[PDB]
Design a binder for this molecule. Structure first.
Ligand code: NAI
Ligand code: NAI
Ligand code: AE5
Ligand code: AE5
Ligand code: CL
Ligand code: CL
Lengths: 310, 310
């Protein structure tokens, strides 16, 4: 009985640091979600602050290439502040549905951040205006960085990126390094959240806030907002938005669930005036499908450390 | 960021194949449970049969040597039958409560079976008659084997062991091999469950049944029964038993919870006529405390494979 171990470096080497593999994996997974060919229990929170927890996210995906597993992801808001460590960390375990035996142990933080960015990309394909040019990011942390990276990889027509962080220094670092990575694009450090949001055709919230600040009349007409960090958006926006989209309804306790957009069962953006809001809680099937996708490529390229179970 | 990997062989080498380390670990853990110095969410079942599932069991134990983690344990009743693999398998992850980062990845099946046997031993210390000589095991699988091993290690006064399995061949193998391990003890293969149970001062159920068969008037007066497999015991026994003990009440949806027996807050057996029933659902704090105990000894004896997280 063997298990393939894949650290973050191995995952990158297997192609886990580019958005396309996650877009591909989620596309098939979200299709499976719409066809209800999955099992996804409620995720229990282990708290001993909102960003101080470890969440167990188990799921099963059906099919001929059926896969099971869990994401065991921890978090401490203090980690970057007081320890110079990433806030989130954890492992992903994959399981053979035939025996339920574990077949893979994989680092989770990179996969988690990249699938989350892929959620925004996929939603933008259906909900954002065609050829949108202004992107807005709030929160210059790990998640926000991968959000920006993925959107740039997937949308070549992006010309300006408006960035804001409550911590001015965090925003300054973020803008400066990305300005070097993409010189032809103007990265604009705003002085408040309102200036950044009101200048964005696509707005992504990547903070750790516990109280909303996003007001409805900030949003441009035709704007699409991927509410990744959930708590950033005022209730009025949920009411005044032309279309509200979630990833999984029962999990969020309505225009559509994200899976129905990819299957064409429910249309996405229908005009360039619609203000569309995405509220994705994050699903375990996203982590498991992404992990199983990467794990297979690693096996192909002989990447990873083989462990014995017994 | 490093993680110590410990397979089943490493766990044995670190002393994970003797009951005493589990009795020690649970004793402190059950003490912590009684003092409510723990966090233990409800465990979600992942089903895609009763023994066909994967269970996420996360918990946190407080203190100066506080520890967090999860047991991700899968099961397939078909595994021994059609594949010659153990029914249960899985991994245990340990986490540093300060950062919630993972610090250990450990095989779970051995630890799981041994802590479960330690639950029976500890309960027997309080609920079984002093110097009991007749032990009864129903179910000759992996769990039942470790149940027998641990009881023999902890109770030298055991003279006879009555064994039964619905599958006659399973019972025959079990009895024969254990008769060679302990020749001075009479291992008696019974022809029905009733004969085995009615001859036991301590009765342990280790099957995978879904319907009760244990009747009240089978039980001797003074008997103690550790209902490990849960479903073996008829409802009448719960009513007619002099004392009913569980491991965790809220988890089982009453004389005492097991933790209160170890703290002396509630007495155990008070006379040798009391028929006492233990109904242990199994707690994550049992797996996590046992794992953290073993993990520490492995670090001392330089046992295990060091992995990099990034
Ligand atoms: N929906 C999903 O599936 C996922 C959601 N999330 C969420 O994304 C966030 C994680 O971000 P990370 O980069 O990993 O952690 P992080 O701590 O490294 O990033 C936080 C950054 O946002 C900034 N920020 C905080 N609060 C703010 C505010 N009120 N206003 C404006 N700007 C602000 C902070 O200064 C910090 O720079 C968490 O809230 C997490 O819950 C995380 C992963 C996936
Ligand atoms: N309370 C706790 O914390 C724990 C409870 N359990 C339970 O212990 C059982 C696992 O046993 P394993 O040895 O690991 O699996 P196993 O499949 O290897 O053992 C099953 C054995 O019991 C026999 N058996 C089944 N049904 C029966 C019946 N109606 N009557 C009489 N005899 C019978 C089977 O023939 C088989 O030999 C499961 O029911 C599991 O849920 C397992 C682990 C810890
Ligand atoms: N929206 C959820 C976050 N759930 C995320 C957790 C990922 C992480 O903590 O880095 C996930 O889906 O994995 C929340 O606010 O608690
Ligand atoms: N009593 C529970 C069993 N819970 C066990 C699972 C362990 C295993 O499946 O080997 C555990 O506590 O780990 C049930 O009947 O579902
Ligand atoms: Cl916490
Ligand atoms: Cl299953």
């Amino acid at each position: 009985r063997e298990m393939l171990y894949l650290n973050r470096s191995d995952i990158e080497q297997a192609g886990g640091n580019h958005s396309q593999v996650y877009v591909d994996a989620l596309t098939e997974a979200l299709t499976a979600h719409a066809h209800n060919d999955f099992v996804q229990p409620l995720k229990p929170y282990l708290r001993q602050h909102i960003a101080d927890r470890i969440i167990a996210m188990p799921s099963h995906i059906g099919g001929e290439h059926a896969i099971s597993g869990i994401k065991w992801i921890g978090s401490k808001h203090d980690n970057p502040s007081k320890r110079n460590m990433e806030r989130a960390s954890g492992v992903i375990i994959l399981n053979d549905p035939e025996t339920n035996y574990p077949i893979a142990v994989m680092e989770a933080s990179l996969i988690s951040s990249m699938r989350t960015a892929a959620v925004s990309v996929i939603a933008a394909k259906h909900l954002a205006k065609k050829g949108f040019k202004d992107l807005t990011i709030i929160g210059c942390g790990l998640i926000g960085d991968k959000q920006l990276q993925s959107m740039l990889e997937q949308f070549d027509h992006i010309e300006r990126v408006f960035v804001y962080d409550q911590f001015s220094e965090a925003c300054a670092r973020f803008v400066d390094r990305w300005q070097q990575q993409r010189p032809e694009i103007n990265f604009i450090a705003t002085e408040n959240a309102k200036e950044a949001v009101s200048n964005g055709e696509v707005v992504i919230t990547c903070t750790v806030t516990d109280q909303p600040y996003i007001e409805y009349d900030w949003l441009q007409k035709g704007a699409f907002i991927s509410n990744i960090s959930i708590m950033d958006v005022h209730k009025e926006v949920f009411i005044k938005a032309d279309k509200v989209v979630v990833d999984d309804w029962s999990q969020c306790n309505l225009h559509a669930e994200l899976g129905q957009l990819v299957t064409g069962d429910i249309p996405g953006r229908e005009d360039d005036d619609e203000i569309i809001l995405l509220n994705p809680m994050g699903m375990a099937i996203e982590d498991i499908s992404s992990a199983y996708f990467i794990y297979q490529q690693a096996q192909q390229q002989n990447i990873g450390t083989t462990l014995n179970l017994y």
